[PDB]
């Protein structure tokens, strides 16, 4: 029950290339993990 933690830097700040950087990285991570990593790790530690 919490927001994991803080950092004050790990944001998106969409605007130019940075947008595709944070967005593209998060979108891919979920596209590669949502159906692969999350499946493997589910049985394999970490």
From Swiss-Prot:
The organism's place on the tree of life at top rank: Eukaryota
Chief localisation class: membrane
Keyword field contains Glycoprotein: yes
Sections of the chain in a coiled coil: none
GO process annotations (BP): adaptive immune response
Region named Connecting peptide: 1-21
Keywords: Adaptive immunity, Cell membrane, Disulfide bond, Glycoprotein, Immunity, Membrane, Receptor, T cell receptor, Transmembrane, Transmembrane helix
Localization (cell): Cell membrane
GO CC annotation terms, alphabetical: T cell receptor complex
Glycosylation sites: 19
Record topology, Cytoplasmic segments: 42-46
Membrane spanning residue stretches: 21-41
Function: Constant region of T cell receptor (TR) alpha chain. Alpha-beta T cell receptors are antigen specific receptors which are essential to the immune response and are present on the cell surface of T lymphocytes. Recognize peptide-major histocompatibility (MH) (pMH) complexes that are displayed by antigen presenting cells (APC), a prerequisite for efficient T cell adaptive immunity against pathogens.
Domain notes: The connecting peptide (CP) domain contributes to the TR-CD3 assembly and signal transduction.
Subunit structure: Alpha-beta TR is a heterodimer composed of an alpha and beta chain; disulfide-linked. The alpha-beta TR is associated with the transmembrane signaling CD3 coreceptor proteins to form the TR-CD3 (TcR or TCR). The assembly of alpha-beta TR heterodimers with CD3 occurs in the endoplasmic reticulum where a single alpha-beta TR heterodimer associates with one CD3D-CD3E heterodimer, one CD3G-CD3E heterodimer and one CD247 homodimer forming a stable octameric structure. CD3D-CD3E and CD3G-CD3E heterodimers preferentially associate with TR alpha and TR beta chains, respectively.
Name under which the protein is recorded: T-cell receptor alpha chain constant
Source organism of the structure: Mus musculus (Mouse)
Residues of the full protein shown: 91 to 136 of 136
């Amino acid at each position: 029950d919490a927001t994991l933690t803080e950092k004050s830097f790990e944001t998106d700040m969409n605007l130019n290339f940075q947008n595709l950087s944070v967005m593209g990285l998060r979108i891919l991570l979920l596209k590669v993990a949502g159906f692969n990593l999350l499946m493997t790790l589910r049985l394999w530690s970490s």
